Amino acid sequence: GSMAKAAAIGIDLGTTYSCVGVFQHGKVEIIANDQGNRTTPSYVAFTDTERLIGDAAKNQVALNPQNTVFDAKRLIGRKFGDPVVQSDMKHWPFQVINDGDKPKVQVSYKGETKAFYPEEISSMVLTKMKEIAEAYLGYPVTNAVITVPAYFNDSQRQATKDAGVIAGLNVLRIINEPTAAAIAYGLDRTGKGERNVLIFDLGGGTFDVSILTIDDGIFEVKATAGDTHLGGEDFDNRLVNHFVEEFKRKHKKDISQNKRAVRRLRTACERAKRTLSSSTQASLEIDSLFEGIDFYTSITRARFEELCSDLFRSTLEPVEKALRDAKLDKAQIHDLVLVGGSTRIPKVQKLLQDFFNGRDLNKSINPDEAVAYGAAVQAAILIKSTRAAA
Numbered sequence: 001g002s003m004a005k006a007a008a009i010g011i012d013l014g015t016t017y018s019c020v021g022v023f024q025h026g027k028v029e030i031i032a033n034d035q036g037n038r039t040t041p042s043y044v045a046f047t048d049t050e051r052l053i054g055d056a057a058k059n060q061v062a063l064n065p066q067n068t069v070f071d072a073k074r075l076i077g078r079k080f081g082d083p084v085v086q087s088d089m090k091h092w093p094f095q096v097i098n099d100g101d102k103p104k105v106q107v108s109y110k111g112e113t114k115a116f117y118p119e120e121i122s123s124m125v126l127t128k129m130k131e132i133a134e135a136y137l138g139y140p141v142t143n144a145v146i147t148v149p150a151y152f153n154d155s156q157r158q159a160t161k162d163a164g165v166i167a168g169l170n171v172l173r174i175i176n177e178p179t180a181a182a183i184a185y186g187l188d189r190t191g192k193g194e195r196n197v198l199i200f201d202l203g204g205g206t207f208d209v210s211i212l213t214i215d216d217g218i219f220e221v222k223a224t225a226g227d228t229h230l231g232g233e234d235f236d237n238r239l240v241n242h243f244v245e246e247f248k249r250k251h252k253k254d255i256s257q258n259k260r261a262v263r264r265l266r267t268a269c270e271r272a273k274r275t276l277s278s279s280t281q282a283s284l285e286i287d288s289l290f291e292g293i294d295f296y297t298s299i300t301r302a303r304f305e306e307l308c309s310d311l312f313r314s315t316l317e318p319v320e321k322a323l324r325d326a327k328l329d330k331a332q333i334h335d336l337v338l339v340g341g342s343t344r345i346p347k348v349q350k351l352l353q354d355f356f357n358g359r360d361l362n363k364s365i366n367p368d369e370a371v372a373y374g375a376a377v378q379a380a381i382l383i384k385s386t387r388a389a390a
């Protein structure tokens, strides 16, 4: 008759991390990779013997900075001369070259100098997400929905499809990240009448606010705003500067010139930052941090909140701007949706909830998984081929 169809997958192809889900048995399963991680770093590393993707690439970045590529999404579908590209290049340890006004990343790989287009690096990340899904399903996967930022233009959307095609995926559709987060909560299944939804997306390096209107399951992007210089890495930087000062006070030593010590400090700071989202204090314990000195200290959630206070408050400026652009008042927003790991920060949640006069925030779907969750829901809908009954 008709052989059973393979499940289609939903992929959130993120700037820093990617996530894959599948809708089966009336529910979404966010698929962990083989290191048990529900999100996979959007990193690709090159050596004389291997190409590493995901956790394996990110875990060896310290000693291979020139040949470990990350942030390809910031280059995808852009011209080499684009001012965004020119500024971003100063922060990256890997080489970005100009090939006919199109950026390419250039690395040492298997004994040669090789250059890749951003879509080729993204296809490597998509190949890892496809393999993660196939390890769980136990069969080859063909169909996928891939998400993009709402502000992506035609060139950026086509380059994302091209990345999916290089990876051997059939791209069912390119959908906006804020739309996918709304779909995850079933905000397009509430019936007739207009609903205004605000998506608050705080990432590792950027912050995006989107206002959508949903009428009879139809989405319209009403306004987008944000801050390209606001993310999780900025909170990590504030903790780094704080502990560098603390080591200076306590041991009369400036550690800031030993890259290993600074890196070990930053790694510890990011974990302490995560602990502070669930606990009112967190310990920091580093052995032989600098000059054989053990650094055993702590930080309260109140001190961390004070350290990043201006940064957390600045998330409300793009919210007010988006509301002005959508020509809406805060009471007119029906639903608030949180996206990004940085939204687990209690103070960030409290500031936004206080701004919307005590309103509940939708945060029941892990914010670092909501986009892939919605993409997986849509992928299952898009492959249906029901023939009507008489």
Ligand SMILES: Nc1ncnc2c1nc(Br)n2[C@@H]1O[C@H](CO)[C@@H](O)[C@H]1O
Residues within 6 Å of the ligand: 016, 017, 203, 204, 205, 231, 232, 233, 270, 273, 274, 275, 277, 340, 341, 342, 343, 344, 345, 368
């Ligand atoms: N529980 C959490 N509390 C605070 N922050 C978090 C948490 N989980 C994640 Br994930 N993050 C941060 O989200 C960003 C994703 O690129 C990184 O900056 C992570 O540090």
Ligand SMILES: [Mg+2]
Residues within 6 Å of the ligand: 012, 014, 015, 177, 203, 340, 371
């Ligand atoms: Mg995202």
